[PDB]
Amino acid sequence: WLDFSDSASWKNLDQRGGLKVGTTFTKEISPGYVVTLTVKELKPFNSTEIYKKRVAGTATEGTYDPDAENGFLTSAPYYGKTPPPSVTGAAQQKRKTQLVYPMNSTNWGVKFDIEATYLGKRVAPTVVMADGEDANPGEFAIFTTNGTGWEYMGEWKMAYNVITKKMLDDEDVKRRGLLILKDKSVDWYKYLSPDTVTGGLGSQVFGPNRSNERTVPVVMTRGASEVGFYVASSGQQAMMMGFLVVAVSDAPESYGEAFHTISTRDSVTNDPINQPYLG
Amino acid sequence: WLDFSDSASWKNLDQRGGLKVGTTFTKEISPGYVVTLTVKELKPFNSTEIYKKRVAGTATEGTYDPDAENGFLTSAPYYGKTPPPSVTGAAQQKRKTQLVYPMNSTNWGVKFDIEATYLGKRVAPTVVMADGEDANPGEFAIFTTNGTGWEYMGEWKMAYNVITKKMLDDEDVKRRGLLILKDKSVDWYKYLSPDTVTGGLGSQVFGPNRSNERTVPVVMTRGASEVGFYVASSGQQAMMMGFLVVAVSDAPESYGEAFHTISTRDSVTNDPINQPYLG
C-alpha cells in the first residue's frame, strides 16, 4: 500500500499542499521498482463519459456535466459559502495509506496516469485499490481502470454488498432524507453499479459497494433474576438474549435475594485520557 | 439465542401483538430446561435509578424522569404525531433472534424477570446478551443485570470500542447535528459508560459501545496506465492504492496503446431481482 503521508514523495502540489493537475507521487516500492503517479484530472464522476452513457436518453441526461469540478454536494451548507478542500495525503498508520478530500459532504474524483519501471525499463504494473472508509448505502466510492477488468483479491482488515437502488431508497426513507439525494445536480441512481451481483468484477468500473461482514460483542451474566435492555437511536437497535446450559449440573438453585436486591452496581468511573493514573 | 419470532412462545401480548407489563416468553431451550421471561417494566434509561445517580448534583439532574415512557426522541417529527410502536419479536434468521421497537428515532427499554428451571427445579441461569444491530457513536444500547457483573464472551459473526463523550461530540460536528442530541429532555452524555476502558465489564451495566473490527474489499487491475477514484458522500471516503511486485520477472513492457485507448468498459447490466434469467 502506498504511504501518501511521505511528504518527500510528492512534487508540484498547489498553494495548500494539495493535488493539482500535474502533481506527482513517486516511490521506489521495492529495490529497483519505481512507481510514478501523475494527476491527470480532478473531476467528479458526473463529468465522465461513463456517466454520460448511463444517463443518455433518460430524464436526467442533462446532469452530465463535462465541466464539473470537485467540490461540495450542492445540498450541503458549505456549497458556495467556503472553498472546497484539495485532495491530499498530508496527515492533517491507517491514515498514512489514505488519500482524502478532507471535508464532509462532497462529490469529487481524481484520475492518475501510472508508470512503473523495473531497473529503468517500463513494466506493466499490478495495481490494487480499496476504499479505506466504511460506506453506508448513500456513500459511494467508484474505481476505474484502463487495464484489466477488476479482480477481487480478498478483504483487508482494519463476498461484499453491491449498493442497489432499493437499498439507497430504503436508506433515504429510513433517515427521512439523505443529504446526497437532496443534491439534484446529479442522478445518484446512475452512480450505482449496473452489475447488482458483483459490482463490476470483470469490467473497468468497480463499486459502489459496502463491506457485509460485521460482528457484535457478547457479554454474559450468571444468577440473574432481572435483565434490562435500553436503547436510544436515530435508527434502530435490537436485543439478542440467549442462555447457556452446558454447566447446569453444578449450577446453584439461586444466587440469593440478598445478592439480587443490592441496587444496580454501575460501572466505575475510568477515563485514562482525563486521569491517566489512580495515583 | 432465543427465537423471539416463535409466536406460540408468547403469552399476554397487547392489542398490537407487542409486549406489555406481564407479557411472558417461555421456551424449553434444551430437554428439561425451561426459561421464562416476564416483562416487569417498559421504560427508557432516563427513568432508572442508575441514570438518577449519574445526573445527581449536575445541571441536568432534572432530566431524571421516573415516569418516562417508551417512545420517540422528542426531536423526531414522529413525536406526538403518531403513536409509538410496541416492543415485539414478531417478524413483521438474523431477524428471528432479535427483539425490536420497530420504528426509527426512539428512546426505549425493557426489563425482564427471568426464571430458569431444570426438571422443574429452579436453577441459576447463564444469560448472554448482545445488540444485533450496528451502532455509530450516537446509537446507544445498554444492558443491565442483577446477576454477576458482565463478562466478555467474544464476538458473534453477522476487543470493541466504548463510546466516549469525545466520540459523540466529534460525530455531532461531523453530521452537523445528530438528531439524538437535539432531544433536550435527556442528558445523553450520562447514557455513556463511566468506564471508558471496558464499557462496564465486571459491573452490572454494559455499554453503550460499537464493534471495532471492519474489513474493506480489495480489487486488482493489471497493465493500467490510468486509474480513477470517485467519491460522493455525506461523510468522507478515502483512496488506498498499492502495487504488487512479486511477478515482475514475466511482466510485459505494456498491454499496448490499442488496449489502453478503448473507451472505459462499464459493467454489464445484471439485476436478477428485475430480470431473473438471461433467457
Author numbering:
A (entry chain A), B (entry chain A): 1 to 92, 106 to 171, 178 to 298
Article, verbatim:
Bacterial fibrillar adhesins are specialized extracellular polypeptides that promote the attachment of bacteria to the surfaces of other cells or materials. The Streptococcus gordonii (S. gordonii) fibrillar adhesin cell surface hydrophobicity protein A (CshA) is an ∼259 kDa cell wall anchored polypeptide that confers fibronectin (Fn)‐binding properties to this bacterium. CshA comprises an N‐terminal “nonrepeat” (NR) region, which houses the adhesive CshA_NR2 domain, fused to a stalk‐forming “repeat region” (RR), incorporating 17 sequentially arrayed ~100 amino acid domains.
To further advance our understanding of Csh adhesins, we next sought to elucidate the X‐ray crystal structure of the NR2 domain of the CshA paralogue CshB (residues 211–528 of the full‐length polypeptide). Despite repeated efforts, only the dimeric form of CshB_NR2 proved amenable to crystallization. The exchanged region comprises β‐strands 12–14 of each polypeptide chain. The CshB_NR2 fold comprises a β‐sandwich core formed from two antiparallel β‐sheets, one of eight β‐strands and the other of six β‐strands. The periphery of the β‐sandwich is decorated with six α‐helices, which are located between strands β3/β4 (α1 and α2), β9/β10 (α3, α4, and α5) and after β14 (α6).
